């Protein structure tokens, strides 16, 4: 063939922390189909917003918004237990269907995106350019969001373990841990990666008996 | 400057499932330092092997092995709660120190890797070549390992929730769930991504009351 139809930019969805997670990489021959499983961030969450993005930047806000839709009717569950499978499907005509399917409940919602959506040739180029001009800030951004999500995980996990421990936990351990979890929660409200890791480590430093209880 | 000293290939460590996780990207100017936090895969795990890798392939076995060392003395904890911070540090002389530090226990182990370790110019090139010749198989491999680790997570989580539920769970729910967890565990022993997702969904399909109990 003398030609190939390819995606000029990456396609994906916004995930927790405001980061674009890629489902179809830049430069993919179409027709193409890819799927990944995502989940909930909060206990008892009833819905997820799927926000479809085109572009090469790490910040979702820095990419082109192709549309969003909600999947609701997610049944009560602990965070991270629902299996929300997201599929990007680009048919032979260049049309993108994104769907989100709850593997438990069976619910499905889609958005269809025409082949002529997104950035034009000019902007595809200004976009590829910046992904490079800013490769650094993006990396610092992405690792901040990862730290933040790791801190939020440990925040939630440790609180749950404290409950499940209840009386097994000495009051001197419980006072230290709950003070660390307050400072953690205060830090996660910030954009300071080192300060988030300091409170994470503080918590790991005081939680050792908790961990030994939780393991038994 | 007319020259820059740069890393010709990516550097990292082997993580669960046999996948190389990159800590320093190909083409980085040295001196450079980067760190990431990893954790344990099993409850009560006492040690981690750090296995240092150079190269562009997704399978660790497909990369160049720069060395490995263990960090032990990890205190009893639930899986995924320890914070094992791994640092790659390439000084102005081209020497790589990799360290692993337990943020709770304070233990640290390192390996020092001389500047002349790894693949020579020829092999750097044969390596970059294959990362491309095989970009596909690598992606299929990496998403198999991710599915497998997501399935293992849900396997472990659901068993724990069954325990914490105990009598709250109807025996008709508990029989269905424990049968799904047996088939899941049988599938995770395989290299079939679709079969792993089938048992995951089977489990999500039978676990709904469990999820509603676990959330309360």
């Amino acid at each position: 063939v003398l030609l190939l139809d390819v995606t000029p930019l990456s396609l994906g969805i916004e995930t927790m922390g405001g980061v674009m997670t890629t489902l179809i990489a830049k430069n993919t021959t179409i027709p193409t189909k890819h799927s990944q499983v995502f989940s909930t961030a909060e206990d008892n969450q009833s819905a997820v917003t799927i926000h479809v993005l085109q572009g090469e930047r790490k910040r979702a806000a820095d990419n082109k918004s192709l549309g969003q839709f909600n999947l609701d009717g997610i049944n009560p569950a602990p965070r991270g237990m629902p299996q929300i499978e997201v599929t990007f499907d680009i048919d032979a005509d260049g049309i993108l269907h994104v769907s989100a399917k709850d593997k438990n409940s069976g619910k499905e919602q889609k958005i269809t995106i025409k082949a002529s959506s997104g950035l034009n040739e000019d902007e595809i180029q200004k976009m590829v350019r910046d992904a490079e001009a800013n490769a650094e800030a993006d990396r610092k951004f992405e690792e901040l969001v990862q730290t933040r999500n790791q801190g939020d995980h440990l925040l939630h996990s440790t609180r749950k373990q404290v409950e499940e421990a209840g009386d097994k936990l000495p009051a001197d351990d419980k006072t230290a841990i709950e003070s660390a979890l307050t400072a953690l929660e205060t830090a996660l409200k910030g954009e300071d990666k080192a300060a988030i890791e300091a409170k994470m480590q503080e918590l790991a430093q005081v939680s050792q008996k908790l961990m030994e209880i939780a393991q038994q | 400057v007319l020259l820059l000293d740069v890393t010709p290939l990516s550097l990292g460590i082997e993580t669960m499932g046999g996948v190389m996780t990159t800590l320093i990207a190909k083409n980085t100017t040295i001196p450079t330092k980067h760190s990431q936090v990893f954790s344990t895969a099993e409850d009560n795990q006492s040690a981690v092997t750090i296995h240092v890798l150079q190269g562009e392939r997704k399978r660790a076995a497909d990369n160049k092995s720069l060395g490995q060392f263990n960090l032990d003395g990890i205190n009893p904890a639930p899986r995924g709660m320890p914070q094992i911070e791994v640092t790659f540090d390439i000084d102005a002389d081209g020497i790589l120190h990799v360290s692993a530090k337990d943020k709770n226990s304070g233990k640290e182990q390192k390996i020092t890797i001389k500047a002349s370790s790894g693949l020579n110019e020829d092999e750097i090139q044969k390596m970059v070549r294959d990362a491309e010749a095989n970009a596909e198989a690598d992606r299929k491999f990496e998403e198999l390992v991710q599915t497998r680790n997501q399935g293992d997570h849900l396997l472990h989580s659901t068993r724990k929730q069954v325990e914490e539920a105990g009598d709250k769970l109807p025996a008709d729910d508990k029989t269905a769930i424990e049968s799904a967890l047996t088939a899941l565990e049988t599938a995770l022993k395989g290299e079939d991504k679709a079969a792993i997702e089938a048992k995951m969904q089977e489990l999500a399909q039978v676990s709904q009351k469990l999820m509603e109990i676990a959330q309360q």
Partner: peptide, 7 residues
Amino acid sequence: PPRPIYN
């Protein structure tokens, strides 16, 4: 609603 979180 919250954005999906990816494991």
